[PDB]
Task: structure prediction
Amino acid sequence: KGEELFTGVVPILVELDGDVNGHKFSVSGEGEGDATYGKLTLKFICTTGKLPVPWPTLVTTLVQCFSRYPDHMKQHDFFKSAMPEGYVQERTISFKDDGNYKTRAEVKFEGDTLVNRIELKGIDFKEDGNILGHKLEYNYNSHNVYITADKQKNGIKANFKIRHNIEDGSVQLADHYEQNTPIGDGPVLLPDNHYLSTQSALSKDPNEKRDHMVLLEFVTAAGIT
Ligand SMILES: [Mg+2]
Result:
């Protein structure tokens, strides 16, 4: 059972290749997760140079298997149940009045390391919109991820709205539609409706000259008593 793999600290690797309006870039992340406390600490680096989109727009793309599921909800934790073989996460992120990202990620163990391999494609971004114009503040509001089972696909879907803060006090909405499907043939947990409550703190490494993002995230399952 998948959850047995998460009782202690697990190293995480994230590798993203992206193309947004033809701007190609890559991000490499390292860090660790402790699902006991729903805690992620990660540092992401753009290995191709300057990130052509704001870091906060990549937070959701850049391992919900590290959510803390309260014991009374453990039968609803799809993500860990899919491990170690993993799951494929597909998202469409629709930025209101602007372009969209489509992402595909394979999340699985490689040895004792949890790896998230991602391809991101962004299209129809406006040149001086909030994304390609870099008008988003370097922060991240707390939000819920709402999960529902997709039993015909042996997986789950999530929907949620991210509100990115624009530097002028306004909000850039990013609608997220997500589907997750197991990679392996083992049984997985198909949950009741519930949500993940998440909080993310973005920061910088003061010794780091590369374009990068330090992230501290807490994710807790809720919505079932
Ligand atoms: Mg403000």
Summary: The chain has one domain: 1-225.
